Design a protein around this ligand. Structure first.
Ligand SMILES: OCC1=C[C@H](N[C@H]2C[C@H](CO)[C@@H](O)[C@H](O)[C@H]2O)[C@H](O)[C@@H](O)[C@@H]1O
Ligand SMILES: OCC1=C[C@H](N[C@H]2C[C@H](CO)[C@@H](O)[C@H](O)[C@H]2O)[C@H](O)[C@@H](O)[C@@H]1O
Ligand SMILES: OCC1=C[C@H](N[C@H]2C[C@H](CO)[C@@H](O)[C@H](O)[C@H]2O)[C@H](O)[C@@H](O)[C@@H]1O
Ligand SMILES: [Ca+2]
Ligand SMILES: [Ca+2]
Ligand SMILES: [Ca+2]
Ligand SMILES: [Mg+2]
Ligand SMILES: [Mg+2]
Ligand SMILES: [Mg+2]
Lengths: 548, 548, 548
């Protein structure tokens, strides 16, 4: 099959990974010098956060030039060496294609805000690149996203004398997508990078492209047709390149972003629905929500693969959970006011699980065992924490912690001169949490993530098998099978903080002996009614092979 | 004497040595271009791993066709050139005869599985080719060999509706040697390759041919009979060709596989008894087990030679050691569960000795100075590592490392496209460990190996002399003599990491000076009671001649 | 006692150790980022090569500003940060003080060469800073040091129309120490850096300060007097700092550079006389030169410590050995013409010993076991090679090799943009020889060197003891004792490539039991008349204590 289903993804921010030149800002030269690290870890595809020239009011998601490299990050030549050194190691690389919007600093917008007509009486073709209103009464009662910052989705441009549309910050004007020229401007941005050998795109904020009155302005089939033709552009001109969608919607809406077999859209979507039910289930010690929402996912096209994740550069989103579930998650996972932002929790993985490695390893094994491809978030494989003294979501985007030398080894410059300060607290700082330390530590989390990704690699049912949940008799225990190519895997996990027991409904498998994927130690044969007793300790994960 | 008595052997796998044409698979044209390297190393006989057509579920030890060349390796023409060119260089070649079993894919088994009688009533002559049972309760309490994969030595064939026998994988059904038609299918399979000029065979899994109730199904007198008739055949139709047995059994059962003068069996068997004791002694700094298992070896026929070896394409086998011996070896040499498989340790020689050249050289000098003919495992002469992310025993069968270019010089294809990934880790990777490196390096393991073989060749007592152990007064120091044709070699070797003192019982040799084989530097003459005091540095090996 | 008697020194070159900003040149930010490496290695004092502003016609030993930081290396703030971080880790630092001469680009010399009298008829105070002759016929019959470049020690200045003196390159005019203003300018250079906290100075080319007619212009009493004044100044104004002298003279004249108890000079001098004899003896397999030269060295003052070294940033100097010894050394260690330069051999340690780790380990242990404090040349602890296609002695100054990524870890710039190109040959290139590789290799030369130093730390008789050579009966075996604080170390070393036997004269120690410093393994007790038989392997080092 396609390369993205066997892939392990790793999300990083070039400005934050390795500063190669002492100026305090990560760049492609330094990132290139770390490529062996990512290779040796068991990563396959690097997803890089936006690398474009930008005033960095949304850390690079306000693009001011789709066709350059931000000067903090080096040059386009540094980009081409990096992509060269990447593929030379067997790694794929995808970028972040910020389609929905541009920075107010983009040349397109500085021209649109002159007016609908120029001072020489000509039409201004750049004015209909964005969505304008005279009073700003359209689409009202539609959801604000950055609720802690923006009081509305319409803001008044003082020089253009009209309101303009923006689903995100005021300085990120929504692009107007009924205009087929804008459709062509981003087809030709996708082309500029796919020409240089880039292996695909993560596509940012796909649900909110088209806006239609009297609807929610999400998942409009008009938006889906823009994606349907983006896929056809790629299918024809750049076969084998990966399109991956950020679609945080409820399960039935999310699969629409794959398309159908006849009309394809995205190869991969992020599994935003299962992500919060992992954390809920851990605090409730009850895995029902994991099975419920996973059963609300319709089957995907042949070419589709889910992208599974635990965290990313954004807050932990609570936009697609019920009001009760959102209230529970604030109570369980956000004790301090400061950890809240925009209907979500802005904390790293390791802090959220109270730095419990037992819980960390648990959710990692479930990330690795659910159907799809996993994406690790840079630094989670060593246990990085966060700095909520930093505004917006930049509390999870601190520099990668390489050693206990200057600035954690991220730069030769001092921590106060780095773009974001490297974390230095007693628990998560780079004196305690860094790569070099965990390569010498025989038992480190880094070693453990590498070993576990090896354990996955060697069992292709993880990447391509089916899922069948299996009754356990205990809500704390979640059991499922993965079948593919006649290998059958049994993946039992305890979500509770003490010893739990269960009766697994292994009736399809009477006469088979489960044995461990690690060490090939055999468990007792399934017999009789197929009801198989287990005890598990707190947060244990049993990874098992059903030998027939 | 016989040619295999003076020979240095070298075990390689065609699929994995050298890829000629760029498709990622080693082949006979590639192997042919490397015969000069092998010649110059000091090697006399190549033993190749199974080259026959095969679905490769045991890396070609599941044979689908005894009279062909697997398409990966080229053609039978390519085979014929290879054997001409090897013979042109004074090299012998022996193949691998997989007698005990064939692949489920072999057209024999596809026929035998259609039942005891044909759809037209007539009896199916191929059915009695394999061993069957209606309930599969026979031969129980017989050892499983691949304990990590197979729950039983019987497996149900869904179409023939009965159980068949297999000492190894379920896709490797045993051949029925009670049926004398099977004995003749292998004689004629042997005849095929001997007719083409091949100089011999290593025979695979010879203890497990015949199975009988109430016995362990190992070293059965019936099995030996079949072997006796195999040597009687070869002795008659193909004098001078070589039969070498893989018989891992305890000292008293292994010597049986030579036969007697009156009734001969193999010319050579692998000296498995001493092999694990070499490693134990290094870890205990106690050379006792070596002398004890060597002492339990009864004298072998005139024509017979032991095949001495440190490692191979299989795990380090812990099947013929005591329970405490086995448990000690796991502790000392398998820190990870990953390192274990099937009552043994799946690791290359250099990793087993922590890449300590001083230890690597020591076991090699003992390999070269024990009585028999040494075999080198391919790549251990430049110190290759292993890859334990690869399943089964594949982790010691990664591609040979010729230089630091694309895929270590094994192929123009990417490492990802090689049949096994060429090792690229910072310690053993082909950037650090390769043949071009070590032909330039004046002191490399490669040149050391070539010189030690050169030194051995100069002293025929190494290949044909007797073995008298000598008292040292220090379990850490192993001392013995070799006596042949008037030469007396004295082989003192320290198995301890620190300096060690010893008093050697050279009472028989009072009046004679010991002198070094290398450099002709004499030690003090032996005098008086001939208790000869010696000091040794860590892992030191003294190769010495006793003057006359 | 004093800190430099217990210190392990480490010689590095900032421009060549670690580049912290991508410009291909090592700098102090970079060197700061590598301080934990040196700390963990067991290094105590960093001797940094000249770091001053200079046109680098002799790699910075032609100084053009004694009170600044060469812009390649960063700023004086960077230097202050480095000194703070070095001291924060218990590391001392010393600089290289180029006393005998400045660059012709030095402000003083641009001034001096204007003439004795300026355009306005008034005299030029800087003319008498340097050594001038009207026809250049003085001090005739005086050695030329840089014989492959310079034809005379007098050169005609174009503008001054006179001859100036230079024991070195013509772009390094000798300072004139009969002028007392000169003497004050270098007390003043000393004070500047000694005021920033620098712990001392390696003093360059100290024998050749004062020149006098009718002498060799070496080791003259007037030169020693200026050095006594330099010691007096530091003794009073900066107690506790280190003056270390580079004086390669014959054993008699070397010891003068310590001064007397009453009129002290240098705290330490390099033990140049012994350095070639270590190499002579390894090739002859006869250690009498080691003993003869060590015994021509008179006792040193109470404050004196020797500095022992195998190699450095220069050539292996053959200036102070006989004509026959020098011809031998050329035959043994300079097969190619390209390997000689000015009475000496310009190769790194590992190439000199054919990359034989047995011989590298032997001479390193003698380095650690002779009387003195040891200085390690950077990269020798990982086995770095040389690049003899670079001019002068730069072949041994190639960038440190850290990992196997871009430029070996030395810089993110490409190798072709690095000040000197990092080695990439198949034997010594950073793809085979680098720090990260050798941290993962359980048996690397780096770990060996670390552990051998730790062994040395544990036994103060190495730093502080006396030395008595011990008869052996075999010139290939060098045996001596180190006695201090009633601890008695016996050190035995074989300089030949085969086994060697000998009879240690241990009469002073009858009744004592020798044990290995590593492992505490006992040799037999000395009995009888203390004539102790020993056998050694090739290049063995027995490191023994005599248990009382
Ligand atoms: O509901 C999904 C989300 C989308 C949005 N994430 C993407 C779109 C935004 C475009 O400017 C950007 O801030 C964010 O980093 C992107 O990954 C939003 O910011 C998140 O808070 C939120 O969890
Ligand atoms: O008891 C000795 C052994 C025999 C077996 N080795 C041979 C039998 C198998 C036949 O299919 C084959 O996999 C293996 O490579 C052969 O050399 C076994 O696999 C080993 O693990 C083991 O050391
Ligand atoms: O006689 C000993 C030596 C001193 C000299 N070494 C120092 C003096 C030179 C001063 O310019 C300089 O080139 C060298 O690096 C210094 O360490 C000479 O250049 C060497 O070749 C030689 O080994
Ligand atoms: Ca939009
Ligand atoms: Ca059988
Ligand atoms: Ca002078
Ligand atoms: Mg930068
Ligand atoms: Mg091929
Ligand atoms: Mg620099």
């Amino acid at each position: 099959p396609e390369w993205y289903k066997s892939a392990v993804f790793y999300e990083l921010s070039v400005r934050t990974f390795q500063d190669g030149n002492g100026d305090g800002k990560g760049d492609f030269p330094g990132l290139t010098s770390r490529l062996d690290y990512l290779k040796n870890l068991g990563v396959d595809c690097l997803w890089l956060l936006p690398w474009f020239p930008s005033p960095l009011r949304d850390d690079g998601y306000d693009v001011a030039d789709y066709r350059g490299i931000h000067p903090d990050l080096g040059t386009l030549d540094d980009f081409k060496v990096f992509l060269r050194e990447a593929h030379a190691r067997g790694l794929w690389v995808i970028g972040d294609l910020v389609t929905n919007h541009t920075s107010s600093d983009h040349p397109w917008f500085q021209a649109a805000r002159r007016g609908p007509t120029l001072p020489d009486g000509s039409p201004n073709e750049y004015h209909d690149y964005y969505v304008w209103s005279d009073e700003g009464k359209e689409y009202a009662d539609t959801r604000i996203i950055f609720t802690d910052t923006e009081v509305s989705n319409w803001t008044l441009d003082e020089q253009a004398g009209k309101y303009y549309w923006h689903r995100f910050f005021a300085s990120q004007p929504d692009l107007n997508y009924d205009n087929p020229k804008v459709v062509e401007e981003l087809h030709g941005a996708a082309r500029f990078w796919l020409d240089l050998g880039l292996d695909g795109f993560r596509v940012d904020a796909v649900p909110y492209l088209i806006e239609r009155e009297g609807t929610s302005c999400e998942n409009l089939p008009e938006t889906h047709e823009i994606l349907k033709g983006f896929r056809a552009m790629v299918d024809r001109e750049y076969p084998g390149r990966l399109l991956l969608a950020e679609a945080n919607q409820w399960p039935e809406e999310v699969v629409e972003y794959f398309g159908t077999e006849a009309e394809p859209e995205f190869h991969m979507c992020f599994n935003f629905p299962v992500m919060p039910r992992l954390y809920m289930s851990l605090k409730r010690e009850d895995t029902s929500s994991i099975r419920e929402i996973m059963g609300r996912l319709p089957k995907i096209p042949s070419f589709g693969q889910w992208c599974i994740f635990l965290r990313n550069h954004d807050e932990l989103t609570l936009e697609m959970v019920t009001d009760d579930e959102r209230a529970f998650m604030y109570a369980a996972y956000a004790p301090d006011a400061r950890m809240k932002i925009n209907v979500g929790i802005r904390r790293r993985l390791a802090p959220l699980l109270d730095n419990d490695r037992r819980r960390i390893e648990l959710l990692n094994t479930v990330l690795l065992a659910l159907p799809g491809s996993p994406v690790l978030y840079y630094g989670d494989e060593i246990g990085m924490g966060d700095d909520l003294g930093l505004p917006d979501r930049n509390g999870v985007r601190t520099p990668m912690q390489w050693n206990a030398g200057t600035s954690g080894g991220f730069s030769t410059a001092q921590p106060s001169d780095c773009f974001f300060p490297p974390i230095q607290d007693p628990v998560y700082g780079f004196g305690r949490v860094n790569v070099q330390s965990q390569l010498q530590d025989p038992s480190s989390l880094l070693k453990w993530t590498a070993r576990q990704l090896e354990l996955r690699r060697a069992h292709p049912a993880f990447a391509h098998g089916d899922l069948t949940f299996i009754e356990t008799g205990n809500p704390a225990i979640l059991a499922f099978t993965r079948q593919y190519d006649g290998e059958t895997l049994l993946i039992v996990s305890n979500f509770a903080g003490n010893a739990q027991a269960g009766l697994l409904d292994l009736a399809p498998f009477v006469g088979r002996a489960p044995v461990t994927l690690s060490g090939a130690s055999p468990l007792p044969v399934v017999t009789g009614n197929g009801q198989y007793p287990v005890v598990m300790g707190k947060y244990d994960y049993y990874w098992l092979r059903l030998n027939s």
